[PDB]
Amino acid sequence: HPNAATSDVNVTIDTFVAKLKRRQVQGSYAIALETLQLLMRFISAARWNHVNDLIEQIRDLGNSLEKAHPTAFSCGNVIRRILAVLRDEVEEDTMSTTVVAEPLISSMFNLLQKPKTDYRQVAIQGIKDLIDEIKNIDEGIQQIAIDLIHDHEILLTPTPDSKTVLKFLITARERSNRTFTVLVTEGFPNNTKNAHEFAKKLAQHNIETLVVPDSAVFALMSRVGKVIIGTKAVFVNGGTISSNSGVSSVCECAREFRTPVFAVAGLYKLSPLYPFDVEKFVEFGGSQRILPRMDPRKRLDTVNQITDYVPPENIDIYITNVGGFNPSFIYRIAWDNYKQIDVHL
Amino acid sequence: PGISSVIPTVLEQSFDNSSLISVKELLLNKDLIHPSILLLTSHLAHYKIVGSIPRCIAMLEVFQIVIKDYQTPKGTTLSRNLTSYLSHQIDLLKKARPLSVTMGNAIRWLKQEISLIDPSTPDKAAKKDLCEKIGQFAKEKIELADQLIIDNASTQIEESTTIVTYGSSKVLTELLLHNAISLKKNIKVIVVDSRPLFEGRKMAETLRNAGVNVMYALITSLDTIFNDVDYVFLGAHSILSNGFLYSRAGTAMLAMSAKRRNIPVLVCCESLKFSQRVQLDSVTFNELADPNDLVNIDYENPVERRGNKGALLNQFIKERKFEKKKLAMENKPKGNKIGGKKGSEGESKDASNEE
Amino acid sequence: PGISSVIPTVLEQSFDNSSLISVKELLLNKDLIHPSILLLTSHLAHYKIVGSIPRCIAMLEVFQIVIKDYQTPKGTTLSRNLTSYLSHQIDLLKKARPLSVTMGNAIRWLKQEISLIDPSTPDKAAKKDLCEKIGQFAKEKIELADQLIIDNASTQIEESTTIVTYGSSKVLTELLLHNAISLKKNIKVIVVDSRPLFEGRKMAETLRNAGVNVMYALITSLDTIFNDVDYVFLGAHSILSNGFLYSRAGTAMLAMSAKRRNIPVLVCCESLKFSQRVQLDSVTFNELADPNDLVNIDYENPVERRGNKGALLNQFIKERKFEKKKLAMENKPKGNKIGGKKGSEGESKDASNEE
């Protein structure tokens, strides 16, 4: 189904599209909120009764959105989650309408063997719940992080900007008796300003801050105890695509010198899509903020990438609103909220 | 000598093996100090181009000039205060910025030469020969070494090669140029560079000026061109009797990557680069400049801008420290080629007895 | 009423959060408290044999006994100040010896039971059923599991064996006994002992009580042994949600050695001992005891010589501490034996959400 009705039905779809394509929007949580609002709008004005068709339409829309931007995931993921939420309810409803169902627990082999209600209000309530969850992950993750950190340990903090990570850090700092040292890598391109902002915020409360050059990691990694990352995209085999600037080399170094890695994450930010090749998923970036003027660009060849992928060979813990999970196990967690069907369409 | 100390910035809780700051702006200079040295110091204070090899050559040249300028006095003899002067110069250099092993070796050689020639000889006749000898030494222990390196490369390097390098290793640049223009072969040369120094950029520019296809690289990723890369030379500064290397920036990282993926790395050097002193970590001896290379928001070096950056003491506790020289590993640089042509870095001091 | 105070030896610097200290010698406590629990706690405190398996069972038995003895008040119901009493008991237990994963599980079970039969029932009808239920549970989840494990072990040996062993765990001992007796194979057992609490000696004694061909060694004495010898075994206490081995003392080193010498290790697991709690380091929560565990010199435990050492608080400027529970490497032990016969440690929490 094409983008034909998506103009007269709702007020703000074009602007959303613009935000997606041209990057007017900032913050993944904000994006999620926007998507939720869009969904609400879709629901509120329209009366459907036929549900499966609607679900299919929604799926198609999601697919289209995904196709529109190859490295933006959050919007898609949220939609997928919503679909999943709907689906089980629909299945339940059908079973009531018709009137053995379950022999033991959640079992396989169902892929080979053959398997008026106030529904709208319920759907609305689900959306509200989702919104609430998105709002209050701050009170969700809060007391799982204070179970793995202690005294006389140097902490590497690469690529910080988001309000989740910041809040976590604030919480950590509140119990100031614990000895934690903050090392911040600047992050060559865009991350620098964000890093500076973070530092300023730390200084506001009174937290010690040390500035790290990106080139110097090998001369520091043997001293650093524990590493925390505030990633945006989480994947299948245990790897992540983080919010830009030099992570891969650092991870390699850590692996070489043996260093534990923590991550502040969310299951809604986690993707059921698998990254199979380095040749595709690694996103190259702009050379606008590298060298002034374009006459040397004739013979020389500047190679630059902004956002980077991490192999699962390195990270070991994912501290979430639920709890810390193993990278070579996170697939199960993902499947406890997502499906195998909603991948290739 | 003049004026010392009186400088900002804290001692730093993390990493303080060597003293961190100096003489930049001249006021009340002594009568006997040669201005060339001062000029050199001024250059080094904010230098982009030179690194290890050319510095030593420059120093040698300066010394030669000084020798040319100086004659045997009536009261004091030729070997009376020369040594003292040399010592003073060395001290000044130390004050300015820590030096290299090659420089030390050169100094030692000079001392030996001084010891050799007796003060009873005719003065005019003496320095006439001494200068010649110095010239000969320069020709042999530098240019000839370079030539030897080139020839080593020639036999070893396959029919047209993709080459990766880092820094401002002048010898290697020269070799690259030779490969491009003199012997004529395909040169897919890749150069990496960091934030604080624009050495790599400069090298790239130079290559362009000679007509070479260059691939420019930064910190954020290296593997993007690797995952293809076939043969690699590393940046060099000084060697130890362990089998390790004391070199510039994230060369160690590169070496590690090479070790991980497909093929090891190799470094060619001069026969008078080797030391007999030893170390094994990036905490032993750190080479430092002022934390100001990343204060200016990227692009060019002299800019002077109004913005946000510049909080060394202004806000509630902030430190912006860095390093220049780091430890390169042993198990990965298997190759070492000098004035003695062939050998391994596992043979860490096999040439120190022969010299 | 009850007061702590007076702590023995130096407190060091690191590892300063866990409850380990105080009430070793009895001097005035609360009035109407049942003393059997206290006695049990005391026993646990001065124990040198117990390891993973039996403690929880003992606790369960004690609870059963208490229930059997329990008097329902003449005015008030079965639970009013009972909860307070229970809390007090728990506190006492904590003061004596840390509540492990098994203990937590037991507590949870107790709570569940309480929830099941809540304030409505008389004297000898409720508890009559409850006790029987508890007995049934004991019969089910533990003994049968152990039997299953034993049977798995039985099949796990095919053709010829030469084994190196460590651990206090009863299950391993049972397995060894089975190997010796009702299988009649060509078994060989080499024993490794640990200093803090004696397990190796116990194992040796057990072997003797059967009459086995037995070699004997310790934590450090390892290298000369392997000069034919294949199998290696270990015994764990508890595994977290993380998948890492949160077990007792000297295992990890042994495992590493085994890995190096090219034949891996197999550990045995239980289908109850899994926790919601998340940790990956020594500092978080650890079994910590008084430094009296490392005082005795040579051969046996009770000897006492006034030769070189015999002071702790008098030993000025000295930081004496030791670890009991270790956090072993995840990838190193290959096989794990639970209720579902065989499988990798990639399970982690595949029984936690199963409930």
- Report the residue from A206, A218, A278 with minimal CB separation from B316: A206
For residues B124-147, one letter each, b for 16 or more C-beta atoms within 10 angstroms of the residue's C-beta and e for the rest, the string is eeebeebeeebeebbeebbeebbe
| CB-CB under 8 Å, B250 with A218 | yes
- Report the residue from C243, C283, C354 with minimal CB separation from A326: C243
A51 token code pair: 């549900």
DSSP notation for B101-161:
HHHHHHHHHHHHHHHHS-TTS-HHHHHHHHHHHHHHHHIIIIIIHHHHHHHHHHHHS-SSE
Interface test with C, best of A104, A144, A150 (most C CBs within 10 A): A150
- Report the residue from B208, B212, B327 with minimal CB separation from A296: B208
**Looking at CA atoms only, how far is residue A266 from chain B in angstroms?**
25
Q: Do chains C and B touch (3 or more CB pairs under 8 A)?
A: no
Distances (CA, A) of C327 to A315, C180, C253: 18, 32, 11
Which chain A residues contact residue C284 at CB under 8 A? 147-148, 150
Give me the residues paired with residue B161 across strands: B187
| CB-CB under 8 Å, B327 with A219 | yes
Count of residues in chain B = 355
Residues C134 and C193 in one domain: no
- Is residue C6 a part of any domain in this protein? no
- Contacting chains of A (3 CB pairs or more, <8 Å) are B, C
| CB-CB under 8 Å, C281 with A148 | yes
Neighbours of B159 (CB within 10 A): 6
Which chain A residues contact residue C280 at CB under 8 A? 148, 260, 316-317
Task: Specify the DSSP class assigned to residue C71.
Answer: P
Closest among B186, B185, B165 to B268, alpha carbons compared: B165
Give me the residues paired with residue C207 across strands: none
The answer to whether C300 faces chain A, any CB pair under 8 Å, is no
Distances (CA, A) of C157 to B245, C148, C251: 52, 15, 22
DSSP notation for B42-77:
HHHHT-SS--SHHHHHHHHHHHHHHHHH----SSS-
Q: Are C8 and C312 in contact (CB under 8 A)?
A: yes
Q: Amino acid identity, residue C69?
A: D
Q: In chain A, whose CA is at the least distance from the CA of B217?
A: A303
| CB-CB under 8 Å, C281 with A316 | no
| CB-CB under 8 Å, A282 with B219 | no
Residues B50 and B138 in one domain: yes
Q: Are C100 and C237 in contact (CB under 8 A)?
A: yes
The residue with tokens 């030993």 is C315
Domain boundary residue, one of C148, C183, C210: C148
Interface test with A, best of C12, C239, C283 (most A CBs within 10 A): C283
Q: Reduce the DSSP state of residue A182 to 3 states and report it.
A: strand
Q: Are B187 and B164 in contact (CB under 8 A)?
A: no
**Looking at CA atoms only, how far is residue A150 from chain B in angstroms?**
19
**Ramachandran bin of C305, using left for φ above 0, alpha for ψ from -120 to 50, beta for the remaining angles:** beta
Distances (CA, A) of B250 to A259, B255, B326, C146: 19, 9, 8, 55
CA gap B210, C331 in Å, rounded: 54
Interface test with C, best of A227, A314, A329, A336 (most C CBs within 10 A): A329
Residues C241 and C253 in one domain: yes
Give me the residues paired with residue C238 across strands: C246
CA gap A51, A63 in Å, rounded: 18
- Helix B35-45 with B53-69: angle, nearest 10 deg: 160
Domain boundary residue, one of B131, B148, B165: B148
Residues C163 and C142 in one domain: no
Calculate ∠ Cα B183-B233-B40, nearest 5°: 90
CA gap C234, C267 in Å, rounded: 5
- Is residue C86 a part of any domain in this protein? yes
Give me the residues paired with residue C193 across strands: C218
Residues B189 and B338 in one domain: yes
Give me the residues paired with residue C189 across strands: C163, C214
3-state secondary structure A60-123: HHHHHHHHHCCCCCHHHHHHHHHHHHHHHHHHHHHHHHHCCCCCCCCCCCCCCCCCCCCHHHHH
- Contacting chains of C (3 CB pairs or more, <8 Å) are A
CA gap C207, C180 in Å, rounded: 9
Residues B133 and B169 in one domain: no
Residues C144 and C167 in one domain: no
The answer to whether C25 faces chain A, any CB pair under 8 Å, is no
Neighbours of A90 (CB within 10 A): 15
- Contacting chains of B (3 CB pairs or more, <8 Å) are A
The residue with tokens 């307070």 is C84
Interface test with B, best of A218, A278, A308, A310 (most B CBs within 10 A): A218
Residues B279 and B313 in one domain: yes
Distances (CA, A) of B299 to B195, B219, B305: 10, 15, 12
- Is residue B2 a part of any domain in this protein? no
Residue C129, burial from CB neighbour count under 10 angstroms (0-12, 13-18, 19+)? exposed
Q: Reduce the DSSP state of residue A162 to 3 states and report it.
A: coil
The answer to whether B295 faces chain A, any CB pair under 8 Å, is no
Residues C132 and C164 in one domain: no
- Report the residue from C14, C242, C281 with minimal CB separation from A326: C242
- Report the residue from C280, C346, C348 with minimal CB separation from A260: C280
| Helix (H) or strand (E) segment spanning residue C343 | strand C341-343
Domain boundary residue, one of C83, C115, C148: C148
Closest among A230, A240, A232 to A309, alpha carbons compared: A240
**Looking at CA atoms only, how far is residue A222 from chain C in angstroms?**
18
Q: Reduce the DSSP state of residue C230 to 3 states and report it.
A: coil
| CB-CB under 8 Å, B257 with A305 | no
C99 token code pair: 């509540």
**Tally of structural domains, chain B:** 2
DSSP notation for C245-294:
EEE-STTHHHHHHHHHTT--EEEE--SS-B-S----STTTS-----GGGS
| CB-CB under 8 Å, B194 with A215 | yes
- Is residue C16 a part of any domain in this protein? yes
Task: Specify the DSSP class assigned to residue C326.
Answer: E
**Looking at CA atoms only, how far is residue C275 from chain A in angstroms?**
12
Main-chain phi, psi angles of B233, to 5 degrees: -110, 140
E strand residue ranges, chain A: 153-156, 180-185, 209-212, 226-229, 233-234, 240-241, 261-263, 283-284, 301-302, 305-307, 309-310
Which chain A residues contact residue B256 at CB under 8 A? 218, 252-253, 256
Main-chain phi, psi angles of B91, to 5 degrees: -60, -45
| Structural domains in chain A, sorted by start | 9-135 (1.20.120.420), 137-336 (3.40.50.10470)
DSSP notation for A38-67:
HHHHHHHH------HHHHHHHHHHHHHHHH
Residues whose CB is less than 8 angstroms from the CB of residue A45 and which lie 6 or more positions away in sequence, other chains included: A9, A10
Q: Are A304 and B218 in contact (CB under 8 A)?
A: yes
**Looking at CA atoms only, how far is residue A244 from chain B in angstroms?**
9
Distances (CA, A) of A209 to A231, B317, C116: 21, 7, 54
Q: Are C270 and C145 in contact (CB under 8 A)?
A: yes
C338 token code pair: 């639970």
Residues C307 and C210 in one domain: yes
Which chain A residues contact residue C17 at CB under 8 A? 150
CA gap B148, B131 in Å, rounded: 24
- Is residue B107 a part of any domain in this protein? yes
The resolution, in Å, is: 4.6
Q: In B, residues 135-164, which contact A (CB 8 Å cutoff)? A: none
- Report the residue from C17, C278, C346 with minimal CB separation from A328: C346
| CB-CB under 8 Å, B213 with A301 | yes
Residue B54, burial from CB neighbour count under 10 angstroms (0-12, 13-18, 19+)? middle
Residues whose CB is less than 8 angstroms from the CB of residue C313 and which lie 6 or more positions away in sequence, other chains included: C8, C9, C10
Residues B64 and B89 in one domain: yes
For residue B203, give its domain range.
149-355
Count of residues in chain A = 345
Which chain B residues contact residue A158 at CB under 8 A? none
Which chain A residues contact residue C348 at CB under 8 A? 326, 329
Q: Amino acid identity, residue B1?
A: P
- Is residue B1 a part of any domain in this protein? no
Closest among C224, C216, C220 to C164, alpha carbons compared: C216
Residues C46 and C91 in one domain: yes
| CB-CB under 8 Å, A215 with B219 | yes
| CB-CB under 8 Å, B326 with A219 | yes
- Report the residue from B195, B222, B253 with minimal CB separation from A217: B253
CA gap A262, A324 in Å, rounded: 9
CA gap A114, A95 in Å, rounded: 15
Give me the residues paired with residue C217 across strands: C192
| CB-CB under 8 Å, A306 with B220 | yes
- Is residue B99 a part of any domain in this protein? yes
Q: In chain B, whose CA is at the least distance from the CA of A210?
A: B319
CA gap B214, C209 in Å, rounded: 78
Q: Reduce the DSSP state of residue A222 to 3 states and report it.
A: coil
Q: Do chains C and A touch (3 or more CB pairs under 8 A)?
A: yes
| CB-CB under 8 Å, A217 with B298 | no
| CB-CB under 8 Å, A278 with B256 | no
